[PDB]
Amino acid sequence: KIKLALSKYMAMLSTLEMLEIFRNKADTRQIAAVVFSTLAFIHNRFHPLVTNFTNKMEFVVTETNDTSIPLCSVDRPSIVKMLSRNCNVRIAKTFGAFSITEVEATQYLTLLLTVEHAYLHYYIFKNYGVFEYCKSLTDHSKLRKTSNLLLSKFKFTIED
């Protein structure tokens, strides 16, 4: 069902009819529309019973690292830097006798992970409020709706 979600979102994007665009600084309307569609789709997923979303919310784009995070605002430079950045069966059968690249899949996945983090933050803002939004930003401490998210399907850790 994970690849099901991937294909569903990619089909929705193709309906939108779009790395190149991210570096395409002047394409602000496109970026706003795509992030709008993505936020609506994530709202649909995390809330299967609530599909309605803010159909007109303000947007903005940042371009400098001082305007970068280490009305929706986006860190265009960093995201551009990112986008630019079984045996037995097959042996048994060896004796029995519009394309998307894998790196593009990685890019789309990183985009989705960043956007779902941003949408989690946005949801925190909407329900808990602006202050507890800032608290979540300062402290990011899943499954409680959340099952509709592919993030809960994989875990990443750190070690010194």
């Binding site: 690292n65 280490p70 983090h117 402290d139 990011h140 401490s141 899943k142 499954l143 993030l151 809960s152």
Partner: peptide, 17 residues
């Protein structure tokens, strides 16, 4: 770049299901 102390644990919370 920002000369900023990093929080491994906050990132883990971002990616701790």
């Amino acid at each position: 770049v920002s000369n900023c102390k990093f929080n491994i644990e906050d990132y883990n919370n971002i990616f701790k299901v």
